[model samples]
Target: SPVRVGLSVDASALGHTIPPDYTGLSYEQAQMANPNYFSGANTQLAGFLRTLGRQGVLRIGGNTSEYTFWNRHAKPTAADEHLAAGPDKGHHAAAREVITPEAVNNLSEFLDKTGWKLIYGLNLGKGTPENAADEAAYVMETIGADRLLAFQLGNEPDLFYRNGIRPASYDFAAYAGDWQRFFTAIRKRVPNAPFAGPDTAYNTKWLVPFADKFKHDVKFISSHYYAEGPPTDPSMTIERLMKPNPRLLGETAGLKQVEADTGLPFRLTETNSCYQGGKQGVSDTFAAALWAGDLMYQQAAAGSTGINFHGGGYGWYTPVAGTPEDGFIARPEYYGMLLFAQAGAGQLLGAKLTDNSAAPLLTAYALRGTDGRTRIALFNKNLDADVEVAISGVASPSGTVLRLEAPRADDTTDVTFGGAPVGASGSWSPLVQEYVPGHSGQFVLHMRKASGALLEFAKLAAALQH
Candidate 1:
């Protein structure tokens, strides 16, 4: 016997147009140490990024953004700190490094090969506005404005006061003054420099005020999110992390009004399942994959222009694992990204999911491509139960069903999608087939716990004709 539910997908009802660069990656400033990943020396990294998408954004900044400095010289600076904290306290700092013209040139070459854009962050905590302009000028001259997205002035300015980086009285008003100074300085040097900013971690209250003050100069509003916390927090469980939390979605409420006012889309410049390098078992497991897929779709549905998952040489909550020399491995989270890139490439369609029970255990989203093909993405978050979904509105809907599967949600090994794992060289080949046949104008699918499926259907006009 199978549980029954109703799924009505209206192709006529349209939603947000998914951006081509909807999927992105974020790294700390220090990761520039091993420039191979960004410089194209490491074929594994380049090949892996190509698998995700040809055109994506690479955000280079985090907590390290506040401490990083840019110098024209390729050599180390005398004022550079011998040791600094990494993106988070749990991650260790690498040897002190500085940005240089040569590095930016290499990055330009890397971007050309990968077809990705750059969001470079400038130091604000200890940097002068004049110094920031100098660095921006160098970056524009070297990377060329065509390859750059925008220059971010700071990282998580909301915590400046709390972290003792700024005075106790420092607020949005004070930050605006500082921001203007940097903007004026940069504009003077580059004539009209674009920017993306106010990258807040928890202080979302700063978004509107920042937008109100600098809307004209801003290119995209930005922020950061971590579903749980500092990794050491005992409450961060896979079960807790997987639950549909309304609070996570509500954080964007204020940004919508700002978007309306500025006519610019907001991007979650940095986000992941858990903060502080992520839990060893929770973030690196299959459960995180389920959570991640849900997160991406939810953000897209909420009208976000794009999302950049934070990772690099340090974090365990990374999509791509391993170092530059060792060659990289595709973590379970990478599969979630791949799924989103495949299913979320078109305009979002209206999808209403209903189950007999009070609280449904599954979530579904429908996306219609320009070719009129519709992709219905289903995720079963329930750890112990299976869901049988009966989708209507199509007389004969047929397409491939690619499944993300593992022995258990918590399992770190033997995870596969469509019965195959991503190869060491970053090649992915999934088993493609049609959905199991159901009766009448409905199609039935049994979604196992902690797994997800992408059902791509033929054009709806043919179904209407039938």
Candidate 2:
């Protein structure tokens, strides 16, 4: 017998507004992928952002943020200092790098054309508040404050003490002191300079203190998540990628309290399937896409305002691949984001699972759109077992099913959404629909292993009306 699953969605019982700008990308400052990848000749890059609705934020800063210098000239700054070579050296030779004015100018134009915002990170490690203020002034002047979201002072500051970026005794109070110095300098130049922080990795406890001290100016709280990492974890696998991540849930729950206290929304500013540039087979597969879709819904349900999946040409977890000449292609992980972008929008609805022991391998989410339609998304992570789901309270017996599929859960190529893959030119037609018929007030939906579907109920009863 097929595994039986039940799902209940209440259109009347609405939840959060599903942030308009919910999806985003995170890139390293050293790579400067946005400036390099989205320039004039790279129209495909702009088209890709348009594919995702062109209204999300772009976080430009990572480990490289701490090492980036603002160079008004093409030449390196005379006073610029270099550190001993480390893992970041490959991204920047001479153990130092500069963010040139041309790069900023090109990025400004790219942002204008793409219709996306920016979350610029300033250097806190070995960078002076004065230099940070100068950089912020130039960024705001060039990019315009309207397209800018907020300035992050540091990336993963909680690891600073551990990594020797700061002293071994570096604590929240110390971090607050350094952050305030930078904030004051930036505000002196930009005046209303917005900020987001502590950008911690494993230490979520930094949120409360950071918020408590800087609540007046902090626009949103932020953090980073990498399911597993260092690229050496032997346990990282497709099966591990498809399982429910309790750390994300527990952290979000804790941050929700901070949100309640500060009245500011929290964001997973940088996250992906794995950290340290991700694992080749695990992070770049179809399983990662399903994991991303489920993770996005979980964050939305937990009251997270937004999430940014970190990737670029320099990493294995990037959603898009190839060069400008070769044409950019959407990877399996990207299809996951596209699926969420299609079915996870609008107001989130209360979706309750019943007797779902298959939950670890199966997940579901429901949302009611402003168009008066409800979309139920079901993901089957069980690579071999099929599940028969009974969806109740759907308006009509007939529903449109949009699927996300690939050759297999581990396949890295030929991924598709709504029956089509996003072309190299960034065009996507999501019209492929599989109609599922129902009886009485419920519909029996067949979920295939390693594939997910978005079921849209367009004509439900008046009580089910949004």
Candidate 3:
């Protein structure tokens, strides 16, 4: 039996239009790599970023955000020396990596290079409010308000006790106290700084109360998520990723409640396929591309402010990899990002999928694009079942499908978008555009099992012109 999809092109149905910068990438604060990594002088990296989205957010914070230290002079401070006393200066520098003016200024220029914004992470776990304010003051001066999205107070404080950053007794109340101190100090310095946080890793419970008490103090509440975890688990696999993710859906529903409860929006400030740097075979394969595209649309459909896939520092699942010095390459997940970017900025319309299967084998989403054309994205996750989809109400006639696929589900290197690899300078042009036809308010689409496609309709109805 075929899956039947009904799309509503009405101007009022789900009028939520995702922002131009809805899709983004997250980086470890340490990935700044002594400041040269995000410098404007790296044209290749800039090109790669621009290729992703001209207006995107490059989030800098992760485990290393817990350890990062700032020194304007780029030299050791007494605390830096004390922290590095236990190990080799280079290795011990984990807790003392000096983030400098050179790095901040260069990062601003990097944003200038790609036209992306920055969510600067502060060192909250082990640093003082005074230090945070001082570092934020310099960042405000260097990166400025236009390019600065928000100042994330800390990386995941929910797990601080386990990580030994906070005591066993530490909880949200204590965390809030620390957050307020930092907010006060930073407010005193920058005065107009926008903030987002409670960057919790494993918990949503931290967000609601944090939102209630601190909503007025922040631009948005931020958090991190991974579909699965630890990579050491036996059940984590490419096969599991191919199916629907119930846990994630539950979280999105819960997040929506948090959003409606407080007017503050929520951002998945850091996220990806699996935690612990992503499962090797699962996250670094064609499976990830399929998973990513579906998840992006799912989040946008659920009204997420944005998503930043956490990467950098040579993580296995980083969409785009390699330093500018070594040249850049597109990883399997990058193809997913490319596919999502292809949808362009548009209003997400309500799409209903009529599937009779016991399990959901396909996912569908429609966008009335800013270009005035309609686009529908289909993801066929069932490896055993190809889907015959009958779609209607697109407001267009013929269209083209941009396929995102590889040789096999777990294959990593053979992935292609529209039948071509991303070019050397971060450019990609769809070389194989498969056209689809529509008639009588309906179109039949054959989406192969384990693949994803973006259907770009050829016409703009009178309704879409506005």
Candidate 4:
């Protein structure tokens, strides 16, 4: 069985912020160190999206999203006393506390080049509705009112409430109220802008009332998902990770039900196997790739708009570790994304499980390309054995064959194509880890367990044409 896998790019997420701890480097030296990220580096986002086959969302803004500084090269600071309090507030000696002119301008350029839309999450935690309104105004002016596919009030208000940075009393209803205030204010600023709400993590009860009362006002509902959080419990084995935990799906499914009730689609915009930047060992392993791949198909089958795998940090090294300056390399989970992006494109028609034996470990998806061809994508969760697949429709085939795989389920070495790993200083060589077919018809990929691979029909072979 083949799983229909698709991928998305979290644009602002691809880069990291200067932590204000490193020293002994001029602005240029610091810039050289973090070459992968800079304020205006988003100019390359559209191109990156196309390279990954263009089935992406390019979510902008992260923890440091609201603080924008636009000159290129990501020049470092002249002096710093190290925040006596903790986590400095003033970024680059500016008090604006919001997106800068250069950030929006480059984002505008990216939209023009890629033609991809956004699910913009405004500043709901540290900023006020007034600030959100102003940001919305700038977005409208830059990306234009129509280019926006959807808008979110904030990233994860649930976490904000939990951290005590906001207020303990700030429950789902309170968060929803904040969203409503934001929607009301933003609508005044950009009258045509659409919205989504309750962008919470682990909070499901809030999706309904927000969607029902503001159905017309909200275009889609968004939330998050995570299998089992970290600290590496021995009880949290691979089988435990693979087990169908209804408790885990219940929250997201409940949100989907709310979407079905409201006649709107919902999306798991931020999710991964573990939270808090993922478990050091587990999240970066091949097991996580399989979990992520299967979960993505589940979301699509459940009628989710998309899945955004949240990541990016120096300390958070993926399978292909090192400074992100070398380019976003594939970790175990990142390979899962590459698998999804490679095969999960075009109109996702539908699919069914042919064998329940594989169902426990593998999920399949069927897709129909505009070129009058049918394709299937498979997600294999086994970390060791090679699963043999038998397909009924591929008696004949067409198009190319593509797949995405990594070294080992737990191997932390970098991902490579033709066996080329990404060098520490940002050089790519042919270090192929997996094989992916590029074409339209049908095929089988000899995928390593606890791994992900994409297979496409190389072409309708002449013998099969008969």
Give lDDT: candidate 2, residue 195.
94
lDDT of 3 by residue, 331-429 (tens): 888888888888888898877776536327678788888887788888888776667787877656688899988878889789899999997758899
Model 2 scores a C-alpha lDDT of 0.78
The most accurate candidate by lDDT is 3
TM-score, structure 1 vs. true: 0.92
Root mean square deviation (Cα) for candidate 2: 4.0
> What is the per-residue lDDT of model 4 for residues 246-302, given as tens digits with 9 covering 90 to 100?
656786577668866888777676665655445656666656666776776666656
Could you tell me the lDDT of residue 197 within candidate 1? 85
For residues 9-116, write the lDDT of model 2, one tens digit per residue.
776787877766888888777644234554655688778776775478888777778878776555533322221111232222224566766667777887887788
Write down the TM-score of every candidate. Answer: 0.92, 0.92, 0.92, 0.73
How big is the positional error of residue 92 in model 2, measured in Å on the Cα after superposition?
A: 12
- Model 3 alpha-carbon drift over 4 Å, by segment: 1-12, 75-95, 356-359, 460-466
lDDT of each: 0.76, 0.78, 0.78, 0.52
Tens-digit lDDT string for candidate 1 (274-308) = 88778888888998778888788878888888888
Q: Give the TM-score of candidate 4.
A: 0.73
